[PDB]
Amino acid sequence: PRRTPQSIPYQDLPHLVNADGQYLFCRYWAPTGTPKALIFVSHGAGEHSGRYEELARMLMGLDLLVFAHDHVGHGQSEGERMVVSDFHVFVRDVLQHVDSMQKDYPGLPVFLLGHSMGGAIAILTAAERPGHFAGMVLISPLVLANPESATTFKVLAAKVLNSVLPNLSSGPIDSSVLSRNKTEVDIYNSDPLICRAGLKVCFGIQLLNAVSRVERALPKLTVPFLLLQGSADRLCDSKGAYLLMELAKSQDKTLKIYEGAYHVLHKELPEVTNSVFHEINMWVSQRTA
Ligand SMILES: O=C(c1nccs1)N1CCN([C@@H]2CC(=O)N(c3cccc(-c4ccccc4Cl)c3)C2)CC1
Ligand SMILES: [Cl-]
């Protein structure tokens, strides 16, 4: 039997099989009655769909059907950890899941919610189906990386690829600089479904591809969106949030900046997280009435 990386059979779990034959672990939060809309939650690099439990519960409380999967190489899905043949795999697999749910809830609007790399995936998914999605909620989306970090990575990648230097990595995710909430940092660090390994050069190249593709997509974007961004984001530079506001053609676009907040706004200090939940609730409520 095909099993998760934790050895649990997929036959016992909600799942899908992607176009490459890989099992992806799925998660669903359905309201008791007819949903008003569907919303797909797109997690980021190194994490998984279970990080979004409370936000998903809030959205299902608004009578949306919330759905997600662990991207290939993440969480309880198959694949070598935190690698991908090409970044578009993630987009393709989101569209598979979206298409399979929409046909069983025909006529319902579909939203996207994404954080960080998951926000890049949401942008590229909406740009691939222009006019299709009802709206997108973006939490610190990967639009422009920290320029020092990105430069460092490009230099390292050239040494590995071009000068064949072995076993080099620019390092693992450092959660301590991604939230000011120390309790959330500790919870993340001990989550058994995250990836704590050093960044592989092949995956960093796909993240660079993502940023390049997002840049080309921004003028095609017409989807309504809410963009939430912290001013002290060490990973997704706030300049990218301003770029997205400027270059998207969407007629319905809103930015909220959280002064002093770090990258993971939905796992930040309680005043920030509570605001993030409130703002998402009101934005989605107003667009699902
Ligand atoms: O919940 C948490 C908490 N932190 C503190 C408290 S809670 N999170 C979940 C969300 N991640 C985001 C999601 C995402 O796409 N990220 C991402 C994006 C681009 C690059 C890299 C990267 C950087 C270096 C090495 C390897 C890699 Cl891959 C990571 C990190 C952060 C931690
Ligand atoms: Cl892509």
Q: Which residues of 162-185 are buried (b: 16+ CB within 10 A; e: fewer)?
A: eeeeeeeebeebebeebbbbeebb
Query: Ligand 1: which of 173, 175, 199 to mutate, most ligand atoms within 8 Å of CB?
Result: 173
Distance of alpha carbon 15 from alpha carbon 114, whole angstroms: 20
Catalytic residue list contains 263 = yes
Which residue type does 286 have? Q
Catalytic residue list contains 116 = yes
Q: Left, alpha or beta for 75 (phi > 0: left; psi -120 to 50: alpha)?
A: left
**Secondary element (H or E) of residue 254:** strand 253-258
Q: Using CA positions, which residue lies closest to atom 6 of ligand 1?
A: 185
CA separation, residue 33 to residues 51, 62, 127, 281 (Å): 25, 11, 31, 19
Q: Which atom of ligand 1 is nearest to the CA of 120?
A: 15
**Secondary element (H or E) of residue 230:** strand 225-230
Query: What was the structure determination method?
Result: X-ray
Considering only CA atoms, give the Rg of the chain.
18
Q: Is residue 64 within 8 Å of residue 35, measured between CB atoms?
A: yes
Q: What is the DSSP letter of 265?
A: G
- Ligand 1: list residues with CB < 6 Å: 44-47, 51, 82, 116-117, 142, 172-173, 175, 178-179, 184-185, 188, 199, 207, 235, 264, 267
DSSP for 12-60, written as a single string: GS-EEE-TTS-EEEEEEE--SS--SEEEEEE--TT--GGGGHHHHHHHH
The neighbour count for residue 252, using CB atoms within 10 Å, is: 12
Distance of alpha carbon 281 from alpha carbon 289, whole angstroms: 12
Resolution in A: 1.4
Active-site annotation holder among 42, 77, 116, 175: 116
Q: Is residue 121 within 8 Å of residue 91, measured between CB atoms?
A: yes
Q: What is the β-pairing status of strands 64-69 and 110-115?
A: unpaired
Distance of alpha carbon 89 from alpha carbon 75, whole angstroms: 16
Class of domain 1-289: alpha beta
